[PDB]
């Protein structure tokens, strides 16, 4: 009720709805995809010139579940995710895999 703390983010994934399901995704990698307004440097900028674009990504990891309904907590490396990402798509990958 006192305000927000921006070093941790809350992510809702499709088809989890349970704490036991959210525990499967602890440690998985997460990225937020957006676009800028010109071509800046990227990974494999010189080896794969076809990758150059306005697209950019911000990465993070899942730390622990939140609540009892399948929400997870995410830390975005060192910085924090921008507030313009609220309500938008987040990618939850399947690696690193324990299975």
């Amino acid at each position: 009720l006192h305000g927000q703390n921006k070093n941790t983010a809350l992510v809702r994934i499709e088809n989890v709805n349970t704490t036991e399901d959210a525990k499967w995704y602890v440690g998985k990698r997460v990225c937020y995809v957006y676009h800028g307004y010109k071509i800046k440097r990227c990974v494999r900028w010189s080896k794969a010139p076809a990758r150059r674009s306005n697209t950019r990504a911000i990465w993070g990891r899942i730390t622990r579940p939140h609540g009892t309904s399948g929400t997870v907590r995410v830390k975005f490396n060192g910085s924090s995710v921008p507030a313009s990402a609220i309500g938008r798509r987040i990618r939850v990958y399947l690696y690193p895999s324990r299975i």
Binding site: E14, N15, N17, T18
Partner: protein, 178 residues
């Protein structure tokens, strides 16, 4: 398993001393959530009846009693609750249950909803498993007859927690969202 208020039997006495060697040993039946509350009720009863305080007495047993089996029975519970503007009120009520602990737990919840009486204002005088043909309440005697039947109507059926959809298709179980 479901009911709170387990069945406790507390045995105690006043500490031996001169001017009263070999004091009488008393037995007490109480229904409490845990044995710490059970011993607290035992000393309250001892103080107000035998003029014996917990400082000058000792507890010999705080055992848990065992019930018979898992059949359906009738239980008569005579109970008393205190309130201002009315003093002490005594009543006898009948319940259907499986064990004595369950029947008394029902009585405590019943007194809460219908008369707004808390746990510490209620004293239980006794509980007994009575047979048919001598229960005086029709809300209990209506389950006695053999060939008793009734349907389940106005049911609210909730799905297992794993399925739990939010938006579902109108003419199918397609689960559009969640």
């Amino acid at each position: 398993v479901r009911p709170h208020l387990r069945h406790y039997c507390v045995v105690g006495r006043e500490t031996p001393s001169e001017k009263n060697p070999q004091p009488t040993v008393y037995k007490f039946e109480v229904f409490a959530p845990n044995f710490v509350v059970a011993k607290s009720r035992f000393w309250r009863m001892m103080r107000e009846k035998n003029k014996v305080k917990s400082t000058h007495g000792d507890v010999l047993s705080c055992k848990v009693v065992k019930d018979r089996k898992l059949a359906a029975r009738n239980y008569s519970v005579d109970i008393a609750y205190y309130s201002q503007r009315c003093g002490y009120t005594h009543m006898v009520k009948e319940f259907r249950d499986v064990c004595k602990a369950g029947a008394v737990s029902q009585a405590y919840n019943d007194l809460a909803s219908r008369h707004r009486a808390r746990y510490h204002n209620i004293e239980v005088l006794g509980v007994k498993s009575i047979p048919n043909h001598e229960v005086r309440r029709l809300n209990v005697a209506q389950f006695h007859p053999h060939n008793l039947s009734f349907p389940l109507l106005q049911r609210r059926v909730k799905a297992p927690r794993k399925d739990r959809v939010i938006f579902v298709k109108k003419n199918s179980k397609r689960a559009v969202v969640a």
